[PDB]
Amino acid sequence: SMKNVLVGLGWDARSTDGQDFDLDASAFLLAANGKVRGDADFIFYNNLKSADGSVTHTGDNRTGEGDGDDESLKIKLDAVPGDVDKIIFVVTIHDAQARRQSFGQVSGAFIRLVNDDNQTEVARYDLTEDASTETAMLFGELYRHNGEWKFRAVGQGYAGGLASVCAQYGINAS
Template identity: 60%
Template structure:
């Protein structure tokens, strides 16, 4: 039975699931009907953060053009350009035991590709969620439904896995940003052109 989280809640992952070493983080969403005439392309991106809350290099930013990070411990399974259909739209596979010790947090975000040019924002997106599955059994362990709290934002930090006393925990964040992926990347220490 999955633990359902609300914004701001934290939950033990490895402590309550002894022996858990591989997880799949699934992200999903639906787009509402609107008159813009452009397709929506939402993207999941992952930032591998050190103690200082920043990436050490561009290699710690995992997305559709750089699908592997953390010495192969974090793998983005690929871009879904439509968000159509049931189930997860994009997934990330993580081998918890192999995440380099310098990485303290694995942060999951969803952004809207070309949001400004297409006049799109998360007010036009519904049913966004993040869930954590046991990578060996596909059992859903944690689920966080983001709700409809966003209007003008073009990027969301949905949640993060983080280390605490030698165990991994999950935090449901649900923070919205304006400025899309570039704003997020700057906040996490990347130089954006």
């Protein structure tokens, strides 16, 4: 029923001498056929907003400076074509993953979801909890039901596969 969704990621940044923590938010499209019509159809910094997906990214931060939802993504499900039938949101660590710095390395990052339609916080996962589990993580999922949108959390964690978690949605694993 959510007519408008707005995700918000936020975390405390720590500048020691130039280095800092910078998470990246993303969204992968997924068809109801069990495979996305093309994972490459995911919104990122290379796309200010979807032309027909009605999706729009607020902006990818570079440190987390902001006493509020650092990064965020606006999705007007009330304008999602009939092509896609399932969408998912994800938050992966930037290059800090190579230097071994999962979100846990941060002081305590947090995710937030709200329906820009009703303006009521829906939920928020704590990275400090699913952080010591890996480096990347999925907040939840979105799908259609009886002609009505419905969000569903799952809590998953990839051992680092920003390039894999993308196409991996196009093919199921063993």
